[PDB]
């Protein structure tokens, strides 16, 4: 439809900002010409082939929601290996959103987290007494951590890397819409694979059928399943695999 033709400067400029936050709001990449190189890495990060452009898929994704985890990091004392080295992983829900009953949130977090575990020799464990590694809560950036709330729209959910006992948690922007049967806003199952995937130190992928595919296409999946590219992606680190194997 060529909607970009009738867009204003404000829209094109907004794009600069929407992506600026996707990799931390750092003035180090603040220059007119850098736009070209800086979109170059965005376009490949997503995978979409139109490089050097800002109008077709590239604007669509700026406006569509996706994830709230920056795609960069810079710290020392990093834990053993980027993904969960531990022999086991544990996970517990902190609170639940009114859109969904606790039972539902709980079984979705697990039905995705478990899929991840089912593609690798890692092992997973149920929680019935004590705290866990990955806490799953609903909250706004002003709950008690860095990164602003954003509100609805851009920035879907922040999550943390498997580091320390406190780090590794997954969060859900409570402002965002969260539901399964209704199949209206963001599917918990689908986002859960993504949010929980970051809890395992997994990164985004470029394949059009990826499970952490950042080019979200809206809608809710009926059954949902893991992707080939993510299964091989993770097995390169853990060596052996379980070839998904699910119902
Ligand atoms: Ca949001
Ligand atoms: Ca944790
Ligand atoms: Zn993400
Ligand atoms: Zn937080």
Residue with tokens 């086991």: 88
Nearest ligand to the CA of 173 is 1
CA–centroid distance, 82 to ligand 2, in Å, is: 15
The number of residues making up the chain comes to: 247
CA distance 127 to 178: 23
- The answer to whether the Cα torsion of 8, 177, 152, 136 is positive or negative is negative
CA–centroid distance, 135 to ligand 2, in Å, is: 6
How many other C-beta atoms lie within 10 A of the C-beta of residue 51?
A: 13
CA–centroid distance, 167 to ligand 2, in Å, is: 4
CB 235 within 8 A of CB 120: yes
CA–centroid distance, 138 to ligand 1, in Å, is: 12
Nearest ligand to the CA of 154 is 1
CB 52 within 8 A of CB 43: yes
CB 180 within 8 A of CB 187: yes
Structure tokens at 9: 């400067």
Residue with tokens 């149920």: 126
CA atoms within 13 Å, Cβ hemisphere of 195: 29
CA–centroid distance, 162 to ligand 2, in Å, is: 7
CA–centroid distance, 68 to ligand 4, in Å, is: 10
Structure tokens at 67: 């994830």
* Closest to 55 in 3D by CA, of 15, 102, 110: 15
Nearest ligand to the CA of 186 is 1
- Tell me what percent of the chain is helix, strand and coil, each rounded to the nearest 5: 35, 10, 55
Q: Provide φ and ψ at 64, rounded to 5°.
A: -70, 145
CB 136 within 8 A of CB 92: yes
CA–centroid distance, 145 to ligand 4, in Å, is: 5
Q: Provide φ and ψ at 179, rounded to 5°.
A: -165, 160
CB 242 within 8 A of CB 119: yes
DSSP code, position 78: P
CA distance 164 to 84: 11
CB 191 within 8 A of CB 157: yes
Q: Which residues pair with 172 in a beta bridge?
A: 138
CA distance 157 to 172: 5
CA distance 125 to 207: 31
CA distance 206 to 95: 33
Structure tokens at 98: 């009114």
The experimental method is NMR
How many other C-beta atoms lie within 10 A of the C-beta of residue 53?
A: 14
Structure tokens at 217: 């296409």
CA–centroid distance, 64 to ligand 4, in Å, is: 21
Nearest ligand to the CA of 216 is 3
β strands within 75-155, DSSP E: 88-89, 91-93, 123-124, 134-139
CA–centroid distance, 178 to ligand 2, in Å, is: 22
CA–centroid distance, 163 to ligand 2, in Å, is: 8
Radius of gyration of the chain (CA): 18
**Residues bordering ligand 4, an ion, CB closer than 5 Å:** 145, 171
Structure tokens at 162: 């498997």
* Closest to 242 in 3D by CA, of 119, 122, 123, 124: 119
Domains by residue range for the chain, with CATH = 1-247 (3.40.390.10)
CB 97 within 8 A of CB 178: yes
Q: Which residues pair with 241 in a beta bridge?
A: none
DSSP code, position 94: -
β strands within the chain, DSSP E: 88-89, 91-93, 123-124, 134-139, 170-173, 178-179, 186-187
CB 235 within 8 A of CB 119: yes
Q: Are strands 186-187 and 123-124 parallel, antiparallel or unpaired?
A: unpaired
CA–centroid distance, 160 to ligand 2, in Å, is: 8
CA–centroid distance, 89 to ligand 2, in Å, is: 10
Q: Provide φ and ψ at 156, rounded to 5°.
A: -95, -50
CA–centroid distance, 174 to ligand 2, in Å, is: 19
User: Is residue 65 classed as helix, strand or coil in its secondary structure?
Assistant: coil
H, E, C per residue of 189-213: HHHHHHHHHHHCCCCCCCCCCCCCC
């Amino acid at each position: 439809p060529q909607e970009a033709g009738g867009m204003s400067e404000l829209q094109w400029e907004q794009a600069q900002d929407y992506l600026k936050r996707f990799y931390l709001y750092d003035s180090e990449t603040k220059n007119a010409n850098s736009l070209e190189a800086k979109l170059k890495e965005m376009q490949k990060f997503f995978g979409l082939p139109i490089t050097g452009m800002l109008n077709s898929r590239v604007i669509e994704i700026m406006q569509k929601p996706r994830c709230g985890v920056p795609d960069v990091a810079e710290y020392s004392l990093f834990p053993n290996s980027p993904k969960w080295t531990s022999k086991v992983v544990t996970y517990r829900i902190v609170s639940y959103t009114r859109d969904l009953p606790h039972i539902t949130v709980d079984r979705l977090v697990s039905k995705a987290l478990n899929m991840w575990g089912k593609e690798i020799p890692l092992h997973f464990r149920k929680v019935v007494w004590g705290t866990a590694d990955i806490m799953i809560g609903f909250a706004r950036g002003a709950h008690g951590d860095s990164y602003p709330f954003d509100g609805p729209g851009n920035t879907l959910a922040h999550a943390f890397a498997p580091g320390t006992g406190l780090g590794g948690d997954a969060h859900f922007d409570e402002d965002e819409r969260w539901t399964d049967g209704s199949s209206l806003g963001i599917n918990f199952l689908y986002a859960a694979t993504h949010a929980l995937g970051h809890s395992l130190g997994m990164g985004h992928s470029s394949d059009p059928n990826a499970v952490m595919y950042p080019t979200y296409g809206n809608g809710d999946p009926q059954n949902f399943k893991l992707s080939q590219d993510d299964i091989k992606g993770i097995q390169k680190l853990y060596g052996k695999r379980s070839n998904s194997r699910k119902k």
